[PDB]
Write a protein that holds these residues in place. Sequence first.
Motif, PDB file in Angstrom:
ATOM      1  N   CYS A 181       0.838  -1.183   0.000  1.00  0.00           N
ATOM      2  CA  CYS A 181       0.000   0.000   0.000  1.00  0.00           C
ATOM      3  C   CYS A 181       0.878   1.239   0.000  1.00  0.00           C
ATOM      4  O   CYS A 181       1.591   1.480   0.973  1.00  0.00           O
ATOM      5  N   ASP A 182       0.821   2.027  -1.070  1.00  0.00           N
ATOM      6  CA  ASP A 182       1.483   3.322  -1.158  1.00  0.00           C
ATOM      7  C   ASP A 182       1.230   3.881  -2.547  1.00  0.00           C
ATOM      8  O   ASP A 182       0.598   3.245  -3.387  1.00  0.00           O
ATOM      9  N   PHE A 212      -6.485   6.725  -3.242  1.00  0.00           N
ATOM     10  CA  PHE A 212      -5.723   7.904  -2.856  1.00  0.00           C
ATOM     11  C   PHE A 212      -5.848   8.164  -1.364  1.00  0.00           C
ATOM     12  O   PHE A 212      -6.893   7.904  -0.764  1.00  0.00           O
ATOM     13  N   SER A 213      -4.783   8.676  -0.771  1.00  0.00           N
ATOM     14  CA  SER A 213      -4.864   9.237   0.567  1.00  0.00           C
ATOM     15  C   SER A 213      -5.263  10.696   0.474  1.00  0.00           C
ATOM     16  O   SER A 213      -5.345  11.264  -0.614  1.00  0.00           O
ATOM     17  N   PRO A 214      -5.520  11.353   1.603  1.00  0.00           N
ATOM     18  CA  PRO A 214      -5.812  12.789   1.527  1.00  0.00           C
ATOM     19  C   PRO A 214      -4.607  13.622   1.138  1.00  0.00           C
ATOM     20  O   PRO A 214      -4.761  14.683   0.527  1.00  0.00           O
ATOM     21  N   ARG A 215      -3.402  13.173   1.475  1.00  0.00           N
ATOM     22  CA  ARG A 215      -2.216  13.888   1.033  1.00  0.00           C
ATOM     23  C   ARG A 215      -1.981  13.673  -0.453  1.00  0.00           C
ATOM     24  O   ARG A 215      -1.646  14.614  -1.178  1.00  0.00           O
ATOM     25  N   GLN A 269      -4.293  15.699  -2.458  1.00  0.00           N
ATOM     26  CA  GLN A 269      -3.919  17.106  -2.492  1.00  0.00           C
ATOM     27  C   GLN A 269      -2.844  17.361  -3.535  1.00  0.00           C
ATOM     28  O   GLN A 269      -2.882  18.373  -4.239  1.00  0.00           O
ATOM     29  N   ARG A 270      -1.859  16.465  -3.629  1.00  0.00           N
ATOM     30  CA  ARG A 270      -0.850  16.571  -4.677  1.00  0.00           C
ATOM     31  C   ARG A 270      -1.490  16.542  -6.048  1.00  0.00           C
ATOM     32  O   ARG A 270      -1.051  17.240  -6.967  1.00  0.00           O
ATOM     33  N   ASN A 278      -3.941  19.984  -6.607  1.00  0.00           N
ATOM     34  CA  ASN A 278      -3.258  21.265  -6.632  1.00  0.00           C
ATOM     35  C   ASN A 278      -2.319  21.415  -7.815  1.00  0.00           C
ATOM     36  O   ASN A 278      -2.063  22.542  -8.235  1.00  0.00           O
TER      37      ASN A 278
END
Lengths: 104, 103
Positions: free
Chosen positions: A13-14, A76-79, A82-83, A86
Amino acid sequence: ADGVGSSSGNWHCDSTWLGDRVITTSTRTWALPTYNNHLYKQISNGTSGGSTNDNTYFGYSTPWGYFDFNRFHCHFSPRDWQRLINNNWGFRPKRLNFKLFNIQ
Amino acid sequence: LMGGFGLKHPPPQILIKNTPVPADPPTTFSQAKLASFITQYSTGQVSVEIEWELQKENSKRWNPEIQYTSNYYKSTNVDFAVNVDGTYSEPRPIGTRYLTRNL
């Protein structure tokens, strides 16, 4: 090599960000019950009983379950999200890879 | 201490001057240095190009990080833009420290 005492997979997971693409892998643990006592059953709803004509249906429920990852937060994670939002004008899925392993 | 990069051999100083053009001399020789010059100035274009190396952000943090953002709410002027009279302004200082790391 398939056996009781050796694992059939690893936890991946990543996300990895390469140039014009991103690869998001995610691993989860699941549990599957027996549904319908191994039976198919027809299900239906009529107007009798105070229900509306709009809500009537006819179909079948199956002993089978199903895997669904259709929501973005699965991948996706929340970080990572965001990448994505944005820095980019657009994105689309290229390809998919799926695995089931370590089954008890 | 004000900020930036300390350099033993920094970018060199670039010095520019208008070469003096004297007015007509006396027609009889005088040793005194010439104090009478034609009034001049010069204009032109200057171009500078810097290549910057970047260090990418490897963070494994789950929750979203703080970013630098423009305010969404309406205003009379756009930030970092000219006004009605035509003058450009910078409304606030913008530092460089937003993303996070672990010690």
